[model samples]
Target: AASTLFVANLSAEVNEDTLRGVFKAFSGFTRLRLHNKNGSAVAFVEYSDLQKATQAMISLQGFQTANDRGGLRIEYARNKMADV
Candidate 1:
């Protein structure tokens, strides 16, 4: 089952703590790896279960940044992180 989420279009100021706070509401949240892609923020979110990851994507897709920086784009990663 898919357990990884690819999140993009995040604000530059969005940090790990903020992301954790947002995703913690969902069960099975595990780890998050954030980075820059073409000057935009991108992230890999890992959950203990597929349901949690799917829920996160459904709930967070098109979510806007706190500072109006941009909207979030959440989707199941095309390939798991280990394959990257």
Candidate 2:
């Protein structure tokens, strides 16, 4: 199991801490990155274990946040780190 990363794009209001809190409900993650490109919110999450990462990617791929704002669309990204 590789420490995998998943990318998320949704509400611009979502911050790094909020994003981390949201995913923490599904798995034990080690790192959370929120990238604000063009003022939009995007995220990259890393799990402590590969199994956990896989589980998150599979189970959370199409899962939506409890926030009434809207649901999240997660994708298995080969690249998950910040560009800059």
Candidate 3:
């Protein structure tokens, strides 16, 4: 059940490598893409399975390490149904 995870609210200090380290801690982590503009940071992380994505979300939601303006926000990319 692979789906793109929408991650947000990250500061400029949070680089791709650090972010990867966060999700890679879980299994089925396939890929990650990050975008930062106007000081707004967003990332989309892909996992091989739904369980891994879920675990990452549950564990990292509202999680902040250091030098961040705030914690993280995680959500589905509006994947309407499993039928997709």
Candidate 4:
């Protein structure tokens, strides 16, 4: 099973410092990326393994904060594409 996550629906001005800081304490946290979408944004959050990923997923799936008033939307990241 994959261990990365697709995190969406975030605060516009948010930075990886705050975002990554939020989950850095979670176990096996290995990677972080905040992709710039036109209107919104997306995130690639990865952990060392499925167990660590799922635990963070379940806990922060619907998590919210001051900047993230809309709440985060988490999904198990689908595979990347090479052809369109």
Candidate 5:
């Protein structure tokens, strides 16, 4: 089962809500967490199912988010999904 998804190389402006809203559109939204990369933006999302996580990857991975502030880049979250 999919535990989490990571959105790295994010812009400083990106936040937890923004990241959650981004993935919610594609499905697989369970838990959302964000990390402040010393002024950079990096975040993570916990999905309820592996398949839903897969869908997010296929449908939204690498897709740009609503705001031009950052792009939506996603992949399976590793042990460390989001670290502040």
Candidate 6:
């Protein structure tokens, strides 16, 4: 199973700090990459294991963004590429 998670609906200004603060609390956290797509920000969060990655997805499904007006969208990445 894939151990990377795709996260969307993020604030345009969201950076590594924003992500690291939230994700580092979880077990098996690896790294994250935030990208800009059509003026919106999306991210790929990699974990050491699929279980930890999936736990993050479930725990953060409706997580609110600090700099945005809506909640986040999280799911497992189908491949190495993250949906943007």
Clashes of each: 0, 0, 0, 0, 0, 0
Cα lDDT of model 3 by residue, 1-84, tens digit:
686788888777777899999889988898888877786688888887787788888888887733346588889767522332
Off by over 4 Å in 3: 65-70, 79-84
Model 6, 1-84: lDDT tens digits are 338888888878777887888887888888888888687788888888888888888988878754455588888887764334
- lDDT (10s digit) by residue, model 2, range 1-84: 336475654667766677777778776677777776775566777776767887887777656733333356666667644433
TM-score for each of the candidates: 0.79, 0.69, 0.79, 0.82, 0.72, 0.83
lDDT of 1 by residue, 1-84 (tens): 448898877777777898878777788887788887566588888887788888888987777644345567788888776633
- 2 against 3, candidate with superior lDDT: 3
Task: Show model 1 residue runs off by greater than 4 Å.
Answer: 66-70
Off by over 4 Å in 4: 65-70, 80-84
Q: Which residue segments of model 2 deviate by more than 4 Å?
A: 65-70, 80-84
RMSD in angstroms, candidate 3? Answer: 4.0
Clashes of 4: 0
Q: Where's the lowest-lDDT run of ten residues in candidate 6?
A: 75-84
lDDT of each: 0.77, 0.66, 0.78, 0.77, 0.68, 0.79
Alpha-carbon deviation at 84 in model 6, angstroms? 22
**Of the candidates numbered 1 and 4, which has the greater TM-score value?**
4
Please report how far candidate 3 places residue 40 from its true position, in Å: 1.8
User: What lDDT does candidate 4 reach at residue 15?
Assistant: 85
lDDT of 2 at 39: 56
Output the number of the lDDT-best candidate: 6
RMSD of candidates 1 onward, in order: 2.9, 3.9, 4.0, 3.9, 4.1, 3.7
